[PDB]
């Protein structure tokens, strides 16, 4: 419980909170305007995440330390941390704004019956491949930095103003999608419907179990984010998957996407593909901008 201010610290005076976006599991997230936060931009539309005002000083420290995990990361397909306001109150962290929010909420809005349907039809095959490659590229970047995500899921991806999908601001959906988590004392909140068998069995998270979860994200894309194993309880899901079960393809699932899921859900984790291998499989079928922005095509890879 210490937070030392660094080069990410920004003056509170630069940040204006404009409207609520939604409740993060630790506090309200707002849309804001930030002055002189990005070099070359006089002003930037941002998201800014806070703690609940009921939070202790130590909880604010823990919040900032958890948020700071993202400081090292620079990838087009991972949501970017822009600044921190730790001095005074309220505690703020300023993030790249993702205009269409989290991918689970977004996908659900595309259901024909949804009250908030934006008029956009469900994703085409080309759109799904594009999303898959973007998610896999962000994940490849993170895994290359020896970072294991542990909670890859549509709710933890975000959708930008230009409809690019990115790995979302980390750990932001435990309130809006609380039912996606099974609390198991000692282990904390477990996203059991997204977890690999060895993670369920042994509490082990690896890049190979991130790949398992990627398979489930593809399933959510093709099902418009139904609950995986709907109508099994959390304890039933945990046993089902440990015993070798995995998700059946949604109705009308495109074959190419089905095949990706099947690779992700191999029982032996050493047999699953890597994220770079996923991007390699998809590379010839993407927007022209992809090689300009991807980790996969970068000298860093």
Ligand X SMILES: O=C1N=Nc2nnc(-c3c(-c4ccccc4)nn4ccccc34)cc21
Contact positions vs ligand X (CB under 6 A): 21-22, 24, 29, 47, 49, 79, 95-99, 101-102, 158, 169, 172-173, 176
Instruction: Give the residue with the Cβ less far from ligand X, 77 or 272.
Output: 77
- Report the binding-site residues for ATP: 25, 49, 96-102, 155-156, 169
**Selected catalytic residue, list 137, 151, 180, 210:** 151
Shortest Å distance, C-beta 21 to ligand X: 4
- Closest residue to bound ligand X by CB: 101
Q: Write the burial class of residue 268 (CB in 10 Å: 0-12 exposed, 13-18 middle, 19+ buried).
A: exposed
**How far, in Å, CA of 123 to CA of 132, rounded?**
12
**How far, in Å, CA of 31 to CA of 56, rounded?**
24
Instruction: Give the residue with the Cβ less far from ligand X, 24 or 191.
Output: 24
- 134 close to 289: Cβ distance less than 8 angstroms: no
Instruction: Give the residue with the Cβ less far from ligand X, 32 or 197.
Output: 32
Q: Is 284 a catalytic residue?
A: no
Instruction: Give the residue with the Cβ less far from ligand X, 49 or 60.
Output: 49
Shortest Å distance, C-beta 215 to ligand X: 22
For residue 37, which of 86, 80, 99 has the smallest C-alpha distance?
80
Between the CA of residue 229 and those of 49, 180, 203, 256, what are the distances in Å? 32, 11, 21, 22
Shortest Å distance, C-beta 163 to ligand X: 13
Shortest Å distance, C-beta 154 to ligand X: 12
Find all residues with CB under 8 Å of 138, minimum gap 6, and list them.
Answer: 75, 77, 78, 166, 167, 295
* Catalytic residue set: 151
């Amino acid at each position: 419980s210490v937070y030392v201010p660094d080069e990410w610290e920004v003056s509170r005076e630069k940040i204006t909170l404009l409207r609520e976006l939604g409740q993060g599991s630790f506090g309200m997230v707002y849309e804001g305007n930030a002055r002189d936060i990005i070099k070359g931009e006089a002003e930037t539309r941002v998201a800014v995440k806070t703690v609940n005002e009921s939070a202790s000083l130590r909880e604010r420290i823990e919040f900032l330390n958890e948020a700071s995990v993202m400081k090292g990361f620079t990838c087009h397909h991972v949501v970017r941390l822009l600044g921190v306001v730790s001095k005074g109150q309220p505690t703020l962290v300023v993030m790249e704004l993702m205009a269409h929010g989290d991918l689970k909420s977004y996908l659900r809005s595309l259901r024909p019956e949804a009250e908030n349907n934006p008029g956009r039809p469900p994703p085409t095959l080309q759109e799904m491949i594009q999303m898959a490659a973007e998610i896999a590229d962000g994940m490849a970047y993170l895994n290359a930095k020896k970072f294991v995500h542990r909670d890859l899921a549509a709710r933890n991806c975000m959708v930008a103003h230009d409809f690019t999908v990115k790995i979302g601001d980390f750990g932001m959906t435990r309130d809006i999608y609380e039912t996606d988590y099974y609390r198991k004392g000692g282990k904390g909140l477990l996203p059991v419907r997204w977890m690999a068998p060895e993670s369920l069995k042994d509490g082990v998270f690896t890049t190979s179990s991130d790949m398992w979860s990627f398979g489930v994200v593809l399933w959510e894309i093709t099902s418009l984010a139904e609950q995986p194993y709907q109508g099994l309880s959390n304890e039933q899901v945990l046993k089902f998957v440990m015993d070798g079960g995995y998700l059946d393809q949604p109705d009308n699932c495109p074959e190419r996407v089905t095949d990706l899921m099947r690779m992700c859900w191999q029982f032996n984790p050493n047999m699953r593909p890597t994220f770079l291998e996923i991007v390699n499989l998809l590379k010839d079928d993407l927007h022209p901008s992809f090689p300009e922005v991807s980790f996969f095509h970068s000298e860093e890879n």
